[PDB]
Design a protein around this nucleic acid. Structure first.
Lengths: 111, 111
DNA sequence: TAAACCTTCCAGCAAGGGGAAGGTCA
DNA sequence: AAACCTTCCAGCAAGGGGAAGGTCAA
């Protein structure tokens, strides 16, 4: 699997994906003999995750942290769990805000 | 009300507030004799909304569109109502994405 | 008069996207 | 030839940081 298919599957551009690799936000792809980046399922998981994170308001740094959370060898550790619930609470503050907006728009529409 | 006060109420920084003004995304504030920007309730309304939209991942164009809905002179019109419910669906799609990510994270946490 | 405001202007990081020049695939 | 891929060199852009200086207030 080459980069354009990965871009389609993940919701990213090819350019964003090379940029994310450059920044060390994702695990690097293997390269075939012709120099082509080639990808595995774990690369899809990471990039899809990054794209979703960015799409709901996380900056690049935070979105990388999310990816690292699922990559962490110490998955079951208190630390990983702490950093996870912290992302959970932020997301929950966003949902509360979106629902506040939702109500306001519906009140506008129902005037 | 001066800009730093607006900042504390809306959750934006002063620099962001002037920038949104510069981009014409919010109604300009008045200026007192000393040149200070001064703000009204309308401004607090726009800027909070803009802070909320950006916080959950909408870009500047989309966020500005949310603000224009509530500003529109043809408020009670069929046209505005249709466009409002249209934005409600986008916000609901956004809520669902956040809940989905929340769900993945909680699954990681309960591992 | 010393802090805590305020103003504008210029700088840098940020998060990428465009497009060129050249190599590869089927 | 179409449609891929590579690196490189650039823009654009949503800001934040900070200089330089005016204003407001005991």
């Amino acid at each position: 699997m080459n980069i354009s298919d990965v871009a389609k599957i993940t919701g990213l551009t090819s350019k964003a994906i090379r940029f994310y690799e450059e920044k060390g936000l994702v695990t690097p792809p293997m390269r075939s003999e012709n120099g082509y980046r080639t990808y595995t399922q774990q690369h899809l998981n990471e990039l899809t995750l990054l794209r979703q994170a960015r799409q709901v308001g996380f900056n690049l740094e935070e979105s990388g942290e999310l990816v690292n959370l699922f990559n962490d060898p110490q998955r079951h550790s208190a630390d990983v769990k702490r950093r996870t619930l912290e992302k959970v609470a932020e997301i929950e503050r966003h949902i509360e805000e979106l629902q506040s907006m939702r109500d306001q728009l519906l009140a506008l529409a129902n005037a």
